Design a protein around this ligand. Structure first.
Ligand SMILES: OC[C@H]1O[C@@H](O[C@H]2[C@H](O)[C@@H](O)[C@H](O)O[C@@H]2CO)[C@H](O)[C@@H](O)[C@H]1O
Ligand SMILES: [Cl-]
Ligand SMILES: [Cl-]
Ligand SMILES: [Cl-]
Length: 138
């Protein structure tokens, strides 16, 4: 598999109709996964499945500006399974990131970082075997 943490450059930043596809397998006894869409040191979109927060499974989404985390957005619909293969699809739309897991819509995350062309890398980390990380224009 690919080395984790993995940096996927996004040349010239994100743009509407850009589709990012991550394929991997969750480790057995996973604690977390993280996708970090970055604008320099800022994190425009942090997508963070948590397998055991107070014995609950939750996805936390947030933005980091000037080294400070913002207001969390929490999704209790939790499509990831310890030990099992997954597909994350992130479609950039004009006003949000649109996330599907295993071909099922999961959540939208409204753009807080407005300079889309400056969000020029994606960090992939946490308790996975990473199979592939790629992008295409639809
Ligand atoms: O918000 C994303 C960010 O969360 C940090 O953890 C938070 C935690 O979610 C919150 O419940 C607590 O009150 O504050 C913690 C510290 O900000 C994680 O440390 C970080 O990695 C992100 O995932
Ligand atoms: Cl914020
Ligand atoms: Cl901005
Ligand atoms: Cl690619």
């Amino acid at each position: 598999p690919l080395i984790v943490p993995y940096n996927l450059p996004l040349p010239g930043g994100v743009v509407p109709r850009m589709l990012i596809t991550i394929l991997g397998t969750v480790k057995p006894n996973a604690n977390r996964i993280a996708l970090d869409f970055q604008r320099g040191n800022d994190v425009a979109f942090h997508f963070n499945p948590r397998f055991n927060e107070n014995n609950r499974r939750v996805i936390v989404s947030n933005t980091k500006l000037d080294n400070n985390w913002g207001r969390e957005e929490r999704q209790s619909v939790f499509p990831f399974e310890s030990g099992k293969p997954f597909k994350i699809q992130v479609l950039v739309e004009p006003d949000h990131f649109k996330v599907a897991v295993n071909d099922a819509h999961l959540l939208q995350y409204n753009h807080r970082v407005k300079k889309l062309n400056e969000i020029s890398k994606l960090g992939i980390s946490g308790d996975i075997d990473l199979t592939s990380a790629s992008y295409t224009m639809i």
